[PDB]
Amino acid sequence: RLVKGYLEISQDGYGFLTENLHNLESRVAIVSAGLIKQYALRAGDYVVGQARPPRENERYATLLKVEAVNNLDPEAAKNRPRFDELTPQFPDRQIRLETTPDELSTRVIDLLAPIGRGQRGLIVAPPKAGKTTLLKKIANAVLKNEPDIKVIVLLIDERPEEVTDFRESVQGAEVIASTFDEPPQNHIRVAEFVHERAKRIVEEGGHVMILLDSITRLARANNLVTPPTGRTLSGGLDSAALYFPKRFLGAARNIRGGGSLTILATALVETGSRMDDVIFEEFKGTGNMELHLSRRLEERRIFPAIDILKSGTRREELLLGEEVTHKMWLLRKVLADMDPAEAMEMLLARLARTKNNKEFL
Amino acid sequence: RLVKGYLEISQDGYGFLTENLHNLESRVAIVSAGLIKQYALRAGDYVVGQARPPRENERYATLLKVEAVNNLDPEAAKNRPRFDELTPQFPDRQIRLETTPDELSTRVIDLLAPIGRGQRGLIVAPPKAGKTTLLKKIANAVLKNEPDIKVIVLLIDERPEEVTDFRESVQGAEVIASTFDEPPQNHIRVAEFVHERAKRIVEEGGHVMILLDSITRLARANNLVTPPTGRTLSGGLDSAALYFPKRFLGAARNIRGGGSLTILATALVETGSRMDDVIFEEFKGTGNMELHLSRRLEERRIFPAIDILKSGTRREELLLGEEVTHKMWLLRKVLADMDPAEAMEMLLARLARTKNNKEFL
Ligand SMILES: Nc1ncnc2c1ncn2[C@@H]1O[C@H](COP(=O)(O)OP(=O)(O)O)[C@@H](O)[C@H]1O
Ligand SMILES: Nc1ncnc2c1ncn2[C@@H]1O[C@H](COP(=O)(O)OP(=O)(O)O)[C@@H](O)[C@H]1O
Ligand code: BEF
Ligand code: BEF
Ligand SMILES: [Mg+2]
Ligand SMILES: [Mg+2]
């Protein structure tokens, strides 16, 4: 028999499991140490095993046996590469980008910031400047382009109506949310839970993509959670308290042996408080691709309102041929003189004629 | 004998009720736990209850019995959905906007800031820039457009003369005020009282609108109440005090099963202290529509002096049909070019000709 959950190991070798609500609910389950030792798995796995109801003198269910682990033979689970020891590479198994629901705006997305397997991406915009629905569109496209990829969406510190909008509009993909109604400890719990789950899932050589609403909101939430860390960075920020979100985003990587972990998250800047500017800068050095969204292009209601000059990716050539290298080099040389708004509208007119590759052809 | 009020449950199951002034008075009455347990009501769910002539040896009145509660059968109260569990949606039961008392400025308001049942709205303006009587006009219009809606007005940290002006000019709708003469404790008491009152009134599937004068003044009141923040935010804010106005404003929501809660509150920016800019940004991400008011437009005495480009709402299409969707799309494409003062003067000249719908026709 297999009850299933996300293992959270307690100090004493036994652990706990949560339910499908992806929040601590009364349906938690307890996990014994002996079986995990028997199969010697790594923390945060999608654990399954046989269990027995709460015994007399026992207030909660307890583990009796295990039959199959992580949907695989437990013996095979005994030997596997460790996630943190996987040889990282640059994204070399690119996800070819072609999505129907909006071929033009999605053309802008593809042509300005490519997305590949294991991309450590980050999108940075001021408040109320085009984030959540953009993430929604990206998720919807991915759920059609690569049905094999396990796509997970995480929402921290956001409005409930957006949560329900996604849950209805995601068409069955794992949508996890934690509205601002919950105390920040709930945010941290859910975030780290999904972090470990994704890590252990990717460790199996799989391709995982996490779309994180409100990452700089999550950073402010850490600051609230941030108990001291010591010295105050400029703007009320903590020095090392960004270490946990730093590792969270740094998980995004390409692995040369198969599988990948790509995180795209929404960051806030120009909020009038140095805290957010410093947070964004601290993340900018850790992500491998950044998407600046210019507040003025949004004020002009040009979507996507991307600050093309400031925006850019790292190692396009590994995702883009020398031919695309040269054509985009020419585009940079030329559009440097074209204004962002006029450039955007010009590109809109041109690409409405043909697909990205058809435009290249 | 029926006493009607808002049960404030104390620690020991016995609670308190207040009087019509919505301020602590000598007329507060005590309540017993047993009947509340019998009818399984929720905090602040409009309580109608019986009692007796208190006995001797009791320093305060004590409750005997209950006859009818929530103006409904108390037994049915035993099983009902809870407010915090209601499935929130975007406002989809729109309140069609047609306001006679001044149809021009209110034309500007309706055509720039849609109002629907459950609108979590926010309006921002520097000091002395057109707030209080604007809220007054909104309240007066609502008291003619939807007589079925229970309209409540809350005034925090404001001048008494405005309080009397409203109480005379509201024509019987619930006007609650707490002048700055009172210490901040009174502000907090009244604010949370109204919070619970509105929440549990909406819990009955009803439509409630709260018009909150002085929301940023209320934020500064919290700052005076800001007990620590731990680390001091830019300007002197609290991390945990802002949680309470955050939840207060986030109460505003649209419910898919009927009823809604709409809060429109007045906010302050450009006050020369980082506190207010930080607070405005903090609320901006929590409200579902924010209305900037430009100080320069007010200096020109343009009412409403709205910074049209900066101002905007979320999910207009959910309130605005495809036809209106495209119409406002064209209007945003065009009016971006018109300068605020001349833009609004032109808008007055044009829309003064016809009603909004007639202008569309
Ligand atoms: N492509 C788009 N076009 C128009 N509006 C958008 C688009 N993408 C997102 N938005 C809007 O931008 C708003 C800001 O996104 P969000 O990340 O929720 O803000 P924050 O996280 O700063 O509170 C969203 O509420 C959404 O309605
Ligand atoms: N449409 C308007 N035209 C002219 N004056 C207005 C208008 N609306 C509000 N006011 C004025 O703006 C003042 C602002 O007071 P208020 O905003 O309540 O103080 P505070 O900002 O301290 O809460 C009011 O006293 C009112 O006289
Ligand atoms: F309103 Be969010 F900060 F984009
Ligand atoms: F009229 Be408000 F105080 F700006
Ligand atoms: Mg949003
Ligand atoms: Mg005013």
Short mmCIF file of C-alpha atoms and ligand atoms in Angstrom, two decimals, chain A residues 128 131-133 158-159 162 213, chain B residues 314, ligand 5:
data_model
loop_
_atom_site.label_atom_id
_atom_site.label_comp_id
_atom_site.label_asym_id
_atom_site.label_seq_id
_atom_site.Cartn_x
_atom_site.Cartn_y
_atom_site.Cartn_z
CA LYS A 128 0.98 47.04 -11.29
CA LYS A 131 3.34 40.80 -14.21
CA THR A 132 0.72 38.28 -13.14
CA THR A 133 -1.23 37.90 -16.39
CA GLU A 158 -0.88 37.95 -3.90
CA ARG A 159 -4.57 38.72 -4.19
CA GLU A 162 -5.92 36.11 -9.04
CA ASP A 213 4.53 35.20 -8.68
CA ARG B 314 -7.69 46.08 -12.92
MG MG C 5 -1.41 41.60 -10.36
#
